[PDB]
Amino acid sequence: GPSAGCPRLTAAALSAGQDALGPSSETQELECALDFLRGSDDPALRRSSLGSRICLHLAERNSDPAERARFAREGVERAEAALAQGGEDDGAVHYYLAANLGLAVRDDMTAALANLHRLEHESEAAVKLSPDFDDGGPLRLLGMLYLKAPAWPAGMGDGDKALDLLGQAVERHPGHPLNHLFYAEALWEVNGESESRRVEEEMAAGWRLLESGSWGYNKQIWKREFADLRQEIG
């Protein structure tokens, strides 16, 4: 449960203050809130995406793959709990279920393939219910799945749908670094050398947002993803 040094907390205060917690929060602050809500019977909090989101913040800040996956697996459990308690209409619950599930499996091919249907279902639910959440996060997840899943007809993989969704994320939510990064990856992988200028400009814009914006402890893992695309394009 909450550690002994945590501030006094109530469900009402956590709900009212839920947006004061984020990627810039220190780990101790995030865990005080996460450990509290696991034990809370407050109907709203029990249905909320907050616990799953906190787990994703903790996953993203951990460079070790096993440690990151451990927190991501906790986020999957928190989102599943929220859905069982009545959060099914909340697009953010499905979003953080799919985002955490992705982190938990994407470094392991067997697990990624084994969870592709669940990822697809949850990413689609997020896109249906709250496509704009987290600056278009659900479009990011579903678009990347269209880019990375086994290619049609073997699976849902479809580069045109990837480009449609990730282009829509960039158009509708230009402030997020990963909308530009992921769109750039799709442009390169689906269209190749003919989109090099656009790929590069999208990378550069994402990097500028990454460097200037306030992404807290998400910055290091996103920087690694930017480097990955740089190396992929040569």
Author numbering: 27 to 260
What's the paper's own text on this?
Finally, BstC is predicted to be a T-component member of the tripartite ATP-independent periplasmic component superfamily, which comprises periplasmic lipoproteins implicated in the cytoplasmic import of small molecules. Two monomers (RMSD of 0.656 Å for all Cαs) in the asymmetric unit form a dimer with 180 rotational symmetry. Each monomer adopts an all-α-helical structure with 12 α-helices in total, designated with H1 to H12; 9 antiparallel arranged helices (H4-H12) form an irregular ring with a pore running through the center. TN1 is closer to the N-terminal face of the structure, while CA1 and CA2 are proximal to the C-terminal face and form two open hydrophobic pockets; TN1 exhibits a mixture of hydrophobic and hydrophilic amino acids. The simulations reveal that the substrate moves approximately 8–9 Å further into the binding site and the polar head makes a hydrogen bonding contact with the side chain of Glu86. Size-exclusion chromatography coupled with multiangle light scattering (SEC-MALS) analysis shows that indeed the purified BstC exists both as a monomer and a dimer in solution with a ratio ~3:1.
C-4 methylated sterols are synthesized in the cytosol and localized to the outer membrane, suggesting that a bacterial sterol transport machinery exists. In this study, we present three putative bacterial sterol transport proteins in M. capsulatus that exhibit remarkable specificity for C-4 methylated sterols. We first used bioinformatics to identify a cytoplasmic membrane protein (BstA), periplasmic protein (BstB), and outer membrane associated protein (BstC).
